[model samples]
Target chain A: DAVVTQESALTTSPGETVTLTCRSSTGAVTTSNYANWVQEKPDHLFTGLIGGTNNRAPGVPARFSGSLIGDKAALTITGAQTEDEAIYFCALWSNNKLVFGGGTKLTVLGQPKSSPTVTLFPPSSEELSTAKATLVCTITDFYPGVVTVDWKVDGTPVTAGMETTQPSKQSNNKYMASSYLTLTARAWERHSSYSCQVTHEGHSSNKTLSRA
Target chain B: EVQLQQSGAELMKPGASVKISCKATGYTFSSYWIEWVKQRPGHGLEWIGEILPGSGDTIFNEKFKGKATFTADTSSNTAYMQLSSLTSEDSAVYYCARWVLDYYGMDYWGQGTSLTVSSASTTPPSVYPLAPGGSAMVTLGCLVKGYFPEPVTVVWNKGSLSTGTHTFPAVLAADLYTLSSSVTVSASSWPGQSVTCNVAHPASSTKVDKKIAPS
Candidate 1:
């Protein structure tokens, strides 16, 4: 049995070097194993970087290379570029299946940033009558688009009934997103304050509201 | 001219099961094996298993045997893998691919399917020394090993710049992978300058360097 694993995430400065690794629990990775690496863009489009431990796939940049490092297989980027910021995936052959490591999100750091606007909308009166309520939090005008959203009720963390949209591109090249937090009319009436927090490299924004 | 079209992303509960499909086109689908690959969040790549559409012969990595099952449907030129007893660890992207040449390597891949295995959720490299040879032309050798993850960088620096007309990447030694490289400097250049071998791995920032001196 082979258990495969990968690094959680990585960040590098543009023009800097970064390496991503993939290992197998069964044993050493060999050329016979046919190790492969893939790069996934921010848009979920994927490109095969290296095949068979070292062969560069068609059109892959020379900056990207794959090799065996110890018992594991690795993908190395010599000079990271701004566009290099994307998730990477490694896959290998074993038994009769293609096993993959968890994908590594490679972030190109040092990019410029702009704070996003955060707005929260309280549950509607019509929905409150049905004993159900929904709060909407919208985040807009952010660069780099990688943002984290957190919700709280009375300052305590809340995850249930929460839905978040993927960062979407705007007309001006910035990004926008929205998150929904559902509540029961009973829970909504009992809570005095609800907040939605958005965090990015530039600044943190919080939208809080109390019962009407 | 080869293409593998795969199924869509899925979000399933711990005990729930999902089967992903991969359809082949532009080639003889029955002539090759459809291999399944896995990618967890923040992780690299793992081999799952493969099934030959022609013979219906299936092979699974020893690790995924009980957790995944492989099947094929010749009528549709498609292959399938079903993951069962799902856990958070199983939540990841899955892909299907095939070898460009028999026993050669995987050359084509399908778009990945994202799988979120929710429930009781969620779980879960270095190098060596140098040896000097010759006079004015001192040849230095560096061997680094026992590192996890692939793709380590072994650089030979003259002054501060990396110099090497290189060769084979790395080799496997039982449980670890190793690579060896040597550079020969003319005695004239070897006399008062610094030449070092630096190996970089994603696993750690362990630097292996040695300076050369005139004998």
Candidate 2:
């Protein structure tokens, strides 16, 4: 077995350069092993960056380069763009197994940030027959595309009925995400307040609904 | 520019079946194999199986067995998967991916086709003959067929000593799944020892698929 390691996070400004390194626990990573890198945007949309250790995949930006830094494989982003903020992962083949790095989250500065608009939609009467009622929270217009969603019932955090989709990119370059909180209708009737809260980069927004 | 466009969502009742298709473009369809993946509602992903349209070579996860069927049509550059005997637990999104065997994973992925099996609903044993290998060892084989919900484990034993076994992933056979595993041992010592193949079924039944006492 082999273990891959990378920096946890790195911050930079647009037009600046950042380099991510991936090291293996086994021996040196070479071209014969086929090292690769993947970039994960919001919403879990993964794109291949480089393959075969140093070759770039099709449509990959010219600013992205992959090569070996000593015994470890490295991916360098030159002239980083606002869209380049994402989580990068490195993979290598060794000993009849494929290994992956923990991931490096890159934060590019100089881009305007905005909070997501919050909306809550209640469960319909017809959905009650399924023995579960759902409350959906839609968060939209957020910048940078990383956010955490939470649910609360009657002032206490709830663990049930929570299904949060990954953040998605919009046409305007903003981001959106939705979270679903489901519980039995009887349980819903017993609670006086249901709230959906969204947090992004230390900023938070909340929307609450009470029994009619 | 290689693309894998998947079929639409499906909603089926119990006892019914549905098949989803993935059409490939911008790449040589026959050059690579298309693999199927399943993501149950609110659950992690599971590797279903893969099929090479050029040669009809297929490999499946032992867990997917009869629950998933993989097929490909070369003329249309399409890959298809069918899930049968639907139940509520079967509801999930299915995705088609390019099997990068050299990398031991998937790189290109298709949009998913959601399947909802919304209904409350809801076995085999065999062993093949032994043979001699190129070396000075004898090969012992075990096969289990006609099993449903296809999760099975095969173990090999040489007298009181546990031996390592190499297994083939389960394959779809009509309404059930089938698999085989083998182990090789020194031929000189076989005549004086006993070799056995034990199979454990997901249906909670454990039995000896076959036994060879040496010739």
Candidate 3:
């Protein structure tokens, strides 16, 4: 199987020209490979933009185009729009099989980036009576919808027993997400401070809850 | 209006063979090709092969030539795949997709069929750092290979903080799987920074960390 590669993420301002490339390990990507491009929006929505190297799908805007650039297959957005802020994935047919590149997250800087409002809630008293306790961290009103959540106990990062949901769009057009941290009731009682940290656009917000 | 409804999940033992089906509807089934894709848990997608329902013609990935057989019943508007010599390495989700030449891609996809080959074997992945290639932006890669019972977790860290990374699907070869991850950083800041790739193989309960430093 040939390895396909793409940029992990890309950022562009509205009206800027951006090109995302997909390179194959086998050799130069060609028309024979039938390069394809797909766009993914929030809520798992996927739409094919280009196929067979440069054939645009019906209803796809003219600004979205595909072609072979140097050694790779490229998807170029001319005059990028704010709505184009989504992940773009490129795929190619190789040896009768289709291989997809790691999708490039395209972030369009049209709207002013907004920081997330973070709130950490301790385990409910009813749930604290159980063997396990759950802490909830709610993040809301973040723009660009790209944020990372981290949990810490006593200022040390922890990974296990954590569940974070993908950022979801709200009616206001901002994004929201939730992260839950689960620990044994005994362990929860033993810990003095639990923190939920959210990082968005180089800004970090921390919300902590200490045992009363 | 096109739809490709695939079969349900299956649990089979080693050496057993199973045939899955994808029933197509709402289009001229024989006019276009139907492709199959494989996705192991927590892995990227892999193209398996494609079959033309009209003429019964088929094309396969060289790696899957002997392991997979493609067949289509035009009368029923359905495509099928029979996977033989099942092993723990073959456990994956299989999808059937409609390949349109005019559209230039698989526009319609079927719900995936999960296949579980009930067996127990463990191979810890070996981690190695790939040398930096010539580019304005510094790209670092970690190759993870020779693993089994597939699911593995990969993380990239610049010093102690985790960074965004891209990981490819695990590719099966000679009864094992190989996977790789890449991260790109600014060239100016990349110099004098310590980067690490952390891999966790649950089946083996092992963790491997490979580090690279700017020369």
Candidate 4:
């Protein structure tokens, strides 16, 4: 029911700062498209080069963001970080399939933000019982399949059983997901936290649930 | 805001049974009624019943007729429905909706969870007459249940209705005969509307838990 559009004119040289934008011709650019962008180095495997249509790849610095652009759906990469040196491609959901645009190689030319990626979701209420328990956090309304819900206890990645399912069919054929992770916990705890870290286009939000 | 995202499909077999879950998120789990619906493959939708994730009250669809049982876990704010004595004809998408009977109409809905009833293993069906929620419409058509020769009774009471607007027959089935009547009602009068449907010589008891409601 929609189409995603991206535009870029790389004016910055191999060491100059630059930014690119991805938008939709219709209304908002949402997850209904399940659109994703992949970038590659000379010999490196193709990875989520540009995410949420505007974010840098993982292990990369900030200066990138994925959100509604103006009144349209867009992702903007600002201050092109050093890791933005590889080629970038943008894809959006159209019809029921993914429509991908051609690739655009970038050579970063300036300093970028130094913040780490973080995502947040609704936190599962504290244990309704007395014992080590799972602290759940949930968030919704994400599209483009660019975000991944990661679980962390304290600062560690939860490698146990993590589940995510989408039952609603959005207008864009994009879907929304509800995710949960069960982690061990003690009744008495300080700041042992659980987070629903959404890994989207290029940005992630981390919401921490703490016990008093 | 949060929403009720559900689990995967259910594959059930004929004469068998299966149960599925609708996990809740977004809002308070206790504030609304979690309803179950049926849409047999390519068929229209049927309102199965509802469960109060808070008080755990339940209701049923006459058509679902002893086919479904609903339950909820307030601890997790999740409500589940178990379908027993399944058939291939029961293969359809089941939805977990909120039945908010507003002054205008039934406006609440769910994205629906698809369930396939094949002859495979599934979550077991809950006990019979699983704690009911409210008034529902049911017909008195049983296989040879109507064509009899002895006397019986239909103890129509005021149980199944939410409002005391409708009434039913209090006739007795004479000779190998069976008495039958159907009426639509509101929510408050169901449980109290007790009219027994009985058959003589063979046996005698209320045919089904009579309950119904209006739009």
User: Per-residue CA lDDT of candidate 4, range A125-144, in tens?
Assistant: 22323233433233333443
> Order of all candidates by DockQ, from best down to worst?
1, 3, 2, 4
User: Where does model 1 exceed 4 Å of error?
Assistant: A13-15, A24-34, A42-45, A69-72, A81-83, A92-99, A109-111, A152-166, A171-173, B6-31, B38-48, B52-57, B61-94, B101-104, B112-215
Candidate 1, residues B1-215, lDDT tens digits: the string is 66788888787888899999888888888889777877664555667777888898987778799999998888888888999988889988898877555334566778888887654222103333333311234445444444543457666773354342232244334334544444556656654666667766655555556443432
lDDT (Cα, 0-100) at B143 in candidate 3: 60
Chain B TM, every candidate: 0.54, 0.54, 0.56, 0.50
Q: Can you give the DockQ of every candidate in the order shown? A: 0.12, 0.01, 0.11, 0.01
Model 3 C-alpha lDDT per residue in residues B123-173, reported as the tens digit of each score: 887665643422456656566656887778888773354453445445554
What value does the lDDT take at residue B154 in candidate 4?
Answer: 30
After TM-score superposition, what is the CA distance of residue A31 in candidate 2 from its true location, in Å?
4.4
Evaluate model 2: give its TM-score.
Answer: 0.51
Residue B97 of model 2 has an lDDT of: 72
Candidates' lDDT values, in order? 0.71, 0.72, 0.79, 0.46
In every candidate, how many clashes are there?
Answer: 39, 1, 0, 75
Interface RMSD of 3: 15.8
Stretches of model 4 off by over 4 angstroms after superposition: A1-212, B101-108, B119-215
Q: Give the range where candidate 4 chain B is weakest over 10 consecutive residues by summed lDDT.
A: B124-133
Model 4, B1-215: lDDT tens digits are: 44665667665557777768878777788878776756553333345667777787776656565888888888888888888887777777776755332211122334555665544221211001111211154322111122222233333343332221111111211112222222233334343454232222234322443222211
TM-score per prediction, in order, is: 0.58, 0.51, 0.64, 0.28
lDDT value for model 4: 0.46
